[PDB]
Amino acid sequence: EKGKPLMLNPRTNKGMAFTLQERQMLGLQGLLPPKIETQDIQALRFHRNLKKMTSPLEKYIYIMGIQERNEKLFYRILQDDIESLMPIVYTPTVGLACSQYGHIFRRPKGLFISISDRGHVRSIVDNWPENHVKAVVVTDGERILGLGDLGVYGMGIPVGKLCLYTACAGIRPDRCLPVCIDVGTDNIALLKDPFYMGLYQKRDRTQQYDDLIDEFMKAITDRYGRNTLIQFEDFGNHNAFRFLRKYREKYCTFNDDIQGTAAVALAGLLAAQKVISKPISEHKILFLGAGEAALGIANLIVMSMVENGLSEQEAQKKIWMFDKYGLLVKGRKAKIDSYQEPFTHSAPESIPDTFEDAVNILKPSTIIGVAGAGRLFTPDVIRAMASINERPVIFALSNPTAQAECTAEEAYTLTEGRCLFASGSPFGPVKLTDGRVFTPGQGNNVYIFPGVALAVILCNTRHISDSVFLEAAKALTSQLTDEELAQGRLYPPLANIQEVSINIAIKVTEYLYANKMAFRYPEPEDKAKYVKERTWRSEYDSLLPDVYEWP
């Protein structure tokens, strides 16, 4: 309306950016200090206030406070210094906040559906004020980064993720809905806490759990549409793979942990090859770890191979996996699951009892660290790759840094700068002795999920096939310039995650349309112009009314 409510609403509050005319006309005069500020000035104010801040957590609390008060300024701010603000609002720090959730808590943020609510999920869904919701991010808080099961504190994740859907892709904030399904928590620490904000019960694993997810899926589509994008996040391996399969062809869904991961990784391996043009038949990849990330990446790698001329079987034979019980080999005592068998091959004559051994026995051309257990890519493992291959492809994806398999410096120096390196955690440029400076790239999931979400939404796509991620991967790598690829950059600078994201969305829409997966039909001729035109801008909208005379 007019007056105060205009200020108590973040979707409208312009704060001191309300002009004099607006303050006067809207009944705000006197309610704000005597100075009128522009959006530029407000961003400049926050930047300074955040600049002189210590912890990433306090930076988080402060910036998220800006979102609950002024959504336009908040995105302007976060878009003005996205490279550094992204890890605060999301990526690494959000996980710190999910730990303090309840202690740092100040104001709710999304939609909470508890197992106690079973049978009434649509009523809870109908309580969501937004009518035109296009992008939903769900989590049950069961697996938050390396923090484990945080219960309802996991809500901090979808919130931060959606923050990026908007900041990078330009997806409308009002059409985004963060959701957290509370079925209980297995984290005893939380259960004991009297300030815990969730169901005081152990994670319900009964059928009720499955039915509740079904209900929630149905309820969301019933009100918002069968094509409403629903992305699972931090669900817990078993549920994440099975729900992905169970719904992928029934709803517009996908799990970023499995597929976004798979695509960012593939994108790296693709930029590598653009360097060492060697027969795809000349590749053998070794995985340090055989879990969620490893499986998603293998599967998408295999798909890249097949589409190039190799059988499914052939593609999978060039992929080996080494988890905490050693090389995933046919018959081994340690058990192997469905998703793993395709990569569980016949034991070599020499069964390694060390990754370094495997690296020597199997002789892979590429190594991928997804074990999340420290520097397991020892100098012995490293130099044992630089010796085996002219240009070793080394991927240490385990986060946070302390968990990585190795640093960039380790990789580069130990390989005299002949390795193609990339990691999940950031590392600065490694300037060796000869003067060479190698700028390593970080394979962050944000390169993929935002542009893929927008493309699917703008094309009214109702089902997301894995082929869209291969397409996505390809689209990311195609962004890398010559010079970028010449300095060890297997990823475009995170500083332009925006145009990279649009470019990715544009390419993906072109793909959806050409493969009849799109349904917004008076089909655009210029898919670029199309996408570019539908991106939400953080610019403030003028509120004045059109007043004119009359002849």
Ligand X SMILES: NC(=O)c1ccc[n+]([C@@H]2O[C@H](COP(=O)([O-])OP(=O)(O)OC[C@H]3O[C@@H](n4cnc5c(N)ncnc54)[C@H](O)[C@@H]3O)[C@@H](O)[C@H]2O)c1
Let me know if 486 is exposed, middle or buried by CB neighbors in 10 A (0-12, 13-18, 19+). Answer: exposed
Interaction of residue 452 with ligand X, rule CB under 6 A: no
- Residue 53 CB, shortest distance to a second copy, in Å, is 11
Interaction of residue 13 with ligand X, rule CB under 6 A: no
Binding site partner of 117, from ligand X, a second copy, none, Cβ cut-off 5-8 A by kind: a second copy
* Interacting residue with ligand X among 89, 115, 290, 381 (CB under 6 A): 290
* Interacting residue with ligand X among 59, 134, 283, 474 (CB under 6 A): 134
Of 482, 474, 473, 484, which is closest to residue 440 (Cα–Cα)? 484
Torsion of Cα atoms, 214 then 216 then 220 then 222, to 10°: 60
* Chain residue whose CB lies nearest ligand X: 291
Interaction of residue 171 with ligand X, rule CB under 6 A: yes
Interaction of residue 373 with ligand X, rule CB under 6 A: yes
Cis peptide before 400 (omega within 30 of 0): yes
- Residue 151 CB, shortest distance to ligand X, in Å, is 19
Which tokens is 30 given? 């006197």
Residue 233 annotated as lining a ligand binding site: yes
339 is catalytic: no
Rounded distance between C-alpha atoms, residue 287 and residue 482, angstroms: 29
Binding site partner of 436, from a second copy, ligand X, none, Cβ cut-off 5-8 A by kind: none
- Residue 375 CB, shortest distance to ligand X, in Å, is 10
- Residue identified by tokens 């530029």 is 40
Rounded distance between C-alpha atoms, residue 74 and residue 424, angstroms: 26
Q: Which residues bind a second copy (CB under 8 A)?
A: 1-4, 7-9, 16, 20-21, 24-35, 41, 44-45, 48-49, 65, 69, 102-103, 106-108, 111-114, 116-117, 119-120, 123-125, 127-129, 152, 155, 182, 194-199, 462, 519, 521-522, 545-548, 550-551
Rounded distance between C-alpha atoms, residue 54 and residue 87, angstroms: 15
| b/e 309-323 (16+ beta carbons within 10 angstroms → b) | ebeeeebbbbbbbbb
Closer of 7 and 385 to ligand X (Cβ): 385
Cα–Cα distances in angstroms (integers) from residue 225 to residues 131, 134, 135, 171, 460, in the given order? 11, 9, 11, 17, 10
Q: Which of 59, 72, 161, 318 is catalytic?
A: 161
Neighbours of 429 (CB within 10 A): 15
Residue 282 annotated as lining a ligand binding site: no
153 is catalytic: no
Binding site partner of 403, from a second copy, ligand X, none, Cβ cut-off 5-8 A by kind: ligand X
Let me know if 116 is exposed, middle or buried by CB neighbors in 10 A (0-12, 13-18, 19+). Answer: middle
- Return the residues of window 335-364 that contact ligand X according to CB under 6 A: none
Rounded distance between C-alpha atoms, residue 21 and residue 518, angstroms: 45
Largest CA distance in the chain: 96
Residue 444 annotated as lining a ligand binding site: yes
Residues involved in catalysis:
90, 161
Q: Where does this chain bind ligand X (CB under 6 A)?
A: 134, 170-172, 175, 221-222, 225-227, 237, 261, 264, 288-294, 322-324, 370-373, 376, 397-399, 403, 424, 443-445, 457-458, 460, 520, 522, 534-536
Q: Which segments are annotated as binding site?
A: 45, 69, 143, 233-234, 237, 257, 290, 292-293, 399, 444
Q: Which segments are annotated as binding site for fumarate?
A: 45, 69
